[PDB]
Design an enzyme around this catalytic site. Structure first.
Site, short mmCIF file in Angstrom:
data_model
loop_
_atom_site.label_atom_id
_atom_site.label_comp_id
_atom_site.label_asym_id
_atom_site.label_seq_id
_atom_site.Cartn_x
_atom_site.Cartn_y
_atom_site.Cartn_z
N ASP A 63 41.11 35.66 39.74
CA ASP A 63 41.15 36.73 40.75
C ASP A 63 40.69 38.06 40.21
O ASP A 63 41.50 38.92 39.82
CB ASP A 63 42.55 36.79 41.41
N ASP A 102 43.47 24.80 42.20
CA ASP A 102 43.88 26.17 41.91
C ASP A 102 45.39 26.17 41.55
O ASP A 102 46.08 25.15 41.74
CB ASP A 102 43.60 27.02 43.16
N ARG A 105 41.27 26.37 37.82
CA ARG A 105 41.58 27.71 37.33
C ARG A 105 42.11 27.67 35.89
O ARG A 105 41.66 28.43 35.05
CB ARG A 105 42.60 28.41 38.27
C1 LIG Z 1 52.65 39.64 42.67
O1 LIG Z 1 51.77 38.81 43.42
C2 LIG Z 1 51.96 38.95 44.81
C3 LIG Z 1 50.87 38.28 45.60
C4 LIG Z 1 50.77 36.77 45.44
C5 LIG Z 1 50.63 36.02 46.77
C6 LIG Z 1 50.21 34.56 46.68
C7 LIG Z 1 48.73 34.37 46.38
C8 LIG Z 1 48.22 32.94 46.30
C9 LIG Z 1 46.71 32.93 46.08
C10 LIG Z 1 46.16 31.56 45.68
N1 LIG Z 1 44.70 31.47 45.41
C11 LIG Z 1 44.36 32.10 44.12
C12 LIG Z 1 42.92 31.77 43.74
O2 LIG Z 1 42.64 32.28 42.43
C13 LIG Z 1 41.96 32.27 44.81
O3 LIG Z 1 40.60 31.98 44.49
C14 LIG Z 1 42.32 31.65 46.16
O4 LIG Z 1 41.49 32.18 47.19
C15 LIG Z 1 43.82 31.91 46.52
C16 LIG Z 1 44.14 31.20 47.84
O5 LIG Z 1 44.22 29.78 47.66
#
Ligand SMILES: COCCCCCCCCCN1C[C@H](O)[C@@H](O)[C@H](O)[C@H]1CO
Ligand SMILES: *[C@@H]1O[C@H](CO)[C@@H](O[C@@H]2O[C@H](CO)[C@@H](O)[C@H](O)[C@H]2NC(C)=O)[C@H](O)[C@H]1NC(C)=O
Ligand SMILES: [Ca+2]
Ligand SMILES: [Ca+2]
EC number: 3.2.1.207
Lengths: 856, 88
Positions: free
Chosen positions: A528, A452, A512
């Site tokens: 997402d 990811d 991704r």
């Molecule tokens: C302006 O944005 C503010 C918020 C952002 C905060 C950080 C978010 C990190 C999420 C990373 N990741 C994205 C994947 O597409 C998901 O499937 C997965 O569950 C998730 C966790 O690994």
């Protein structure tokens, strides 16, 4: 989404410069005195009439009805980027012969015809024809623009700031762009990833489509903003022909589409690199799929388990939670192949580690899942915590394998973390070796991987990604390579899973970010999304846009990532997901638990029904993926692919086909009591797979639905194989007997194939250990023959049943197979539906056999 | 001269089949009663005799699935998973 975090064309100085050039007389001209013709290419110098900059055009005819156009500076200050590792081979060429020549034009014949190319010197233009039919023109609107490299050091041409981020831009303006005209084309598709319609929109009065791998928080629908992946391939379809354009450039790219006797014009504008474009002349859409597959390869054959159902969320809490989820599927008779571990499983997001409180005994947890014949997937991202106690960081820092800033220091994204330079082949080798069972402590053969945030996502970076002026392997800037960074992460991870098994086991990696060629490494998903009906609907056009450009193994998070879906929406999402290639339920950290047995009984039952349909269809899914792997044909298809002359199918995105056999119209509105199903085909018949009711095409059928309904029709003339004995996971089922569903055409015929192997190794390729069967029905005989005699397989799989839709009642049913006496089968027949069920044929799937229906 | 044995009737009365169609790995009864020992019926059940301990019934789809369901291991008799007796 916060649109102010992402550049519009006016905020990207190179897009603004290129887009400000309007249709007119091109300042470029070819200098025909410099023309050189060889067996592999034609080369000629081009000059900009004002600046006097010299460029070189390398024009090539290619085997399989393609043309390649490459344009670069004749005497550059420094070499321009040429995309590596995407093309699977040096494409076989076709000889260009001069068949006409004057002071302003040269006509070239490709091999012995019928394709021809007309090069016009002033203004520079290329016309591609088949005999007397003009297929495409290049630079017809005079929009070619090649910004030459000026002496290294108007607004934003050099140093450029976006919000608080300054791009030092040492090489200044170097963008390239070119336009293409498609006479007779009104429908164009592809260039994912965008949360938009399958048929692409004209961009004239708005923004061009953007291709720049970006992490877009809470992305919105029906807009051209760049999402996580970029495949610079555009398909054009008409009643008369299919064409494709593959723009091989890894830099930020913007695509303008305009309409105009019907004609669509396409303009590509890239930040850096050369102009390198392939024109794929078809003539059929299948010819375009083969053409593109010859260049970038085909979909990697997924291990069978990865085609089952995947249960995920951010995050399963600990080993007890994983084991409770596993047991929940079994206590509620719901199949599942894989349970996923998101970022909370690691030690404070240090990848390749385990939280010692949550996951103290990962090998034991994996052994428990293996006893249930299930797998686990662990997340591994390409950002490495800057921590001297973290072995991965220490090794990458000590070997200088991180992406650097211009001053030579390791780039650090604050929140800090460093980014391995996946463009460096030695870095990819190191990454692959990290997946050995000795290096990745706690891993086992039933542990697979999810990559990811591989755009790369950089929390404090411009547009949440890497600075444009960061430095990679060979001295290339981040701007030159951006769109292939994710692909390299995906490639190195897949190679790691292959290598850890000594080259025997097929990998499973979900990524991704992606680019052209990503189909060779595993699956992708639409990132997402949100728990809303319009996001459920958009999963079809998004995965179809991916399928058209070779990425067959696509899906969207079932239930939606953000927010809490109402139970009805979750049911409809399981039904939709059950008929899409990559089938995973996933959910954001702040959502309520949504394992399917948590719902009221009516909802659990409809979900179980969807899961049973998917599991029973695994032999069909596996065969479609084998055909994608061998031929490069998409698994999930728009209706226009199967009905190219039916103009009413060209924009359809609320239904799709799986291969040539199943047409799916999932329910995608709350409170729906029916769906309008378009059943195409002038002399075609369709069978409702639930009721066996036959419908003649072409028609729009209003089909009633309930909560448990999944509107699916089998096409007359096809044979679909199923495993009717639904068990808890695909490993449990993979040696079971098959039921053949024969849907008779109006001519009383049908055909279909079946691929079988051990379900998980490369033995099908290294040892020819597989079966490819052809089932064919004609007259009153069903025959099994080999579709590939090289494939042999020792298997207990047998044919337990045959269901024939559209058949009369026979007097006798006789089975013949070499090595056995003639057999008489019992049968059941429903005269209302004309469904004939043949009881227990009992023959090995590896054998040739025939079943004859006697009218006696 | 010789009297023939009577055929099998499904517990639901839906069909009458010879006893050679009982546990023949093909589902002939709507209630699954002709296949108590195999995985052939979608609604059948397999009886874990668990000699000496509490008997249990499992889904027919769990017969020879390669997973140990019965503590006596009798559900895995031809799968290539050899189950140990864990009833104690
Ligand atoms: C302006 O944005 C503010 C918020 C952002 C905060 C950080 C978010 C990190 C999420 C990373 N990741 C994205 C994947 O597409 C998901 O499937 C997965 O569950 C998730 C966790 O690994
Ligand atoms: C390459 O192009 C040729 C010409 O368009 C293709 O051959 C034609 O195929 C169509 C069916 O799609 C027939 O109706 C024509 O009669 C064929 N024309 C000729 C001149 O043979 C050919 O199939 C394409 N080949 C590949 C490998 O894509
Ligand atoms: Ca039976
Ligand atoms: Ca079992």
């Amino acid at each position: 989404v916060d649109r102010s975090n992402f550049k519009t064309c006016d905020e990207s100085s190179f897009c603004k410069r290129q887009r400000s050039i309007r249709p007119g007389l091109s300042p470029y001209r070819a200098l025909l005195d410099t023309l050189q013709l060889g067996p592999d290419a034609l080369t000629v110098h081009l000059i900009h009439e004002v600046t006097k900059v010299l460029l070189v055009l390398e024009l090539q005819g290619l085997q399989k009805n393609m043309t390649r156009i490459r344009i670069d500076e004749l005497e550059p200050r420094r070499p321009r980027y040429r995309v590596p590792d995407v093309l699977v081979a040096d494409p076989p060429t076709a000889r260009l012969s001069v068949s006409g020549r004057d002071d302003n034009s040269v006509e070239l014949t490709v091999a012995e015809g019928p394709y021809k190319i007309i090069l016009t010197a002033q203004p520079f233009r290329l016309d591609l024809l088949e005999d007397r039919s003009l297929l495409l023109s290049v630079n017809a609107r005079g929009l070619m623009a090649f910004e030459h490299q000026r002496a290294p050091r108007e607004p934003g041409a050099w140093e450029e700031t976006f919000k608080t981020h300054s791009d030092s831009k040492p090489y200044g303006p170097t963008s390239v762009g070119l336009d293409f005209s498609l006479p007779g084309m009104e429908h164009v598709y592809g260039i994912p990833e965008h949360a938009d319609s399958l048929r692409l929109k004209v961009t004239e009065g708005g923004e061009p489509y953007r291709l720049y791998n970006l992490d877009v928080f809470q992305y919105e629908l029906n807009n051209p903003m760049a999402l996580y992946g970029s495949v610079p391939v555009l398909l054009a379809h008409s009643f008369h022909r299919d064409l494709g354009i593959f723009w091989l450039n890894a830099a930020e790219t913007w695509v303008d589409i305009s309409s105009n006797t019907p004609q669509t014009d396409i303009r590509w504008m890239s930040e850096s690199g050369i102009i390198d474009v392939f024109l794929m002349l078809g003539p059929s859409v299948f010819d375009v799929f083969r053409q593109y597959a010859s260049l970038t390869g085909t979909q990697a054959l997924p291990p069978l388990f990865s085609l089952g159902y995947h249960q995920s969320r951010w995050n399963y809490r600990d080993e007890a939670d994983v084991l409770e989820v596993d047991q929940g599927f079994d206590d509620h008779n719901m199949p599942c192949d894989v349970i996923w571990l998101d970022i909370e499983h690691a030690d404070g997001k240090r990848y390749f580690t385990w939280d010692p409180t949550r996951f103290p005994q990962p090998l034991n947890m994996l052994e428990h899942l293996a006893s249930k014949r299930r797998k686990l997937v662990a997340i591994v991202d390409p950002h490495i915590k800057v921590d001297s106690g973290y072995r991965v960081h220490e090794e990458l820092r000590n070997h200088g394998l991180y992406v650097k800033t211009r001053d030579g220091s390791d780039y650090e994204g604050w929140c800090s973390a460093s980014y391995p330079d996946f463009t460096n082949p030695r870095m990819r080798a190191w990454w692959s070796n990290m997946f050995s069972f000795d290096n990745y402590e706690g891993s086992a053969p039933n542990l697979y991987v999810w990559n990811d945030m591989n755009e790369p996502s950089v929390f404090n970076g411009p547009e949440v990604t890497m600075l444009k002026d960061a430095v990679h392997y060979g001295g290339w800037e981040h701007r030159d390579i951006h769109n292939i960074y994710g692909l390299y992460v995906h490639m190195a991870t897949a190679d790691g899973l292959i290598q850890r098994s000594g080259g025997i086991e097929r990998p499973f990696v979900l990524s991704r970010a992606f680019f052209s060629g990503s189909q060779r490494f595993g699956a992708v998903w639409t990132g997402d999304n949100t728990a809303e009906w319009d996001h459920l609907k958009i999963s079809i056009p998004m995965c179809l846009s991916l399928a058209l450009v070779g990425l067959s193994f696509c899906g969207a998070d079932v239930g939606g990532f953000f927010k809490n879906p109402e139970p009805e929406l979750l049911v409809r999402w399981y039904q939709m997901g059950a008929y899409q290639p990559f089938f995973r339920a996933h959910a954001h950290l702040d959502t309520g638990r949504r394992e399917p047995w948590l719902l009221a009984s009516q909802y659990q039952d409809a979900i179980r029904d969807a899961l049973f349909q998917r599991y029973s269809l695994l032999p069909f899914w596996y065969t479609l993926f084998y055909q994608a792997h061998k031929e490069g044909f998409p698994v999930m298809r728009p209706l226009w692919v199967q009905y190219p002359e039916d103009m009413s199918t060209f924009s359809i995105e609320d239904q799709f086909m799986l291969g040539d056999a199943l047409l799916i119209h999932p329910v995608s509105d709350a409170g729906a009591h029916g769906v309008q199903v378009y059943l195409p085909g002038q002399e075609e018949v369709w069978y409702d797979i639930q009721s066996y009711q036959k419908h003649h095409g072409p028609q729009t059928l209003y089909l009633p639905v309930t909560l448990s309904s999944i509107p699916v029709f089998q096409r007359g003339g096809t044979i679909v194989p199923r495993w009717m004995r639904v068990r808890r996971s695909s490993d449990c089922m993979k040696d079971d007997p098959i039921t053949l569903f024969v849907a008779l055409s109006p001519q009383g015929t049908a055909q279909g194939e079946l691929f079988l192997d051990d379900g998980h190794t490369f033995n099908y390729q290294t040892r020819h250990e597989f079966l490819l069967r052809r089932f064919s029905f004609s007259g009153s005989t069903l025959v099994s023959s080999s579709a590939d005699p090289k494939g042999h397989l020792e298997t207990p799989i047998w044919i337990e049943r045959v269901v024939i839709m559209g058949a009369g009642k026979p007097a006798a049913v006789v089975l013949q197979t070499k090595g056995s006496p003639e057999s008489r089968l019992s049968f059941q027949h429903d005269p209302e539906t004309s469904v004939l069920i043949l009881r227990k044929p009992g023959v090995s799937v590896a054998s040739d056999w025939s079943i004859h229906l006697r009218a006696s | 001269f010789y009297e023939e044995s009577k055929p099998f009737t499904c517990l639901d009365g839906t069909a009458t089949i010879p006893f050679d169609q009982v546990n023949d790995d093909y589902c002939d009864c709507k209630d699954g009663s002709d296949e108590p020992g195999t995985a052939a019926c979608p609604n059948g059940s397999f009886h874990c005799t668990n000699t000496g301990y509490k008997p249990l019934y499992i889904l027919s789809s769990r017969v020879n699935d390669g997973v140990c369901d019965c503590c006596d291991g009798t559900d895995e008799y031809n799968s290539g998973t050899v189950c140990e007796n864990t009833c104690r």
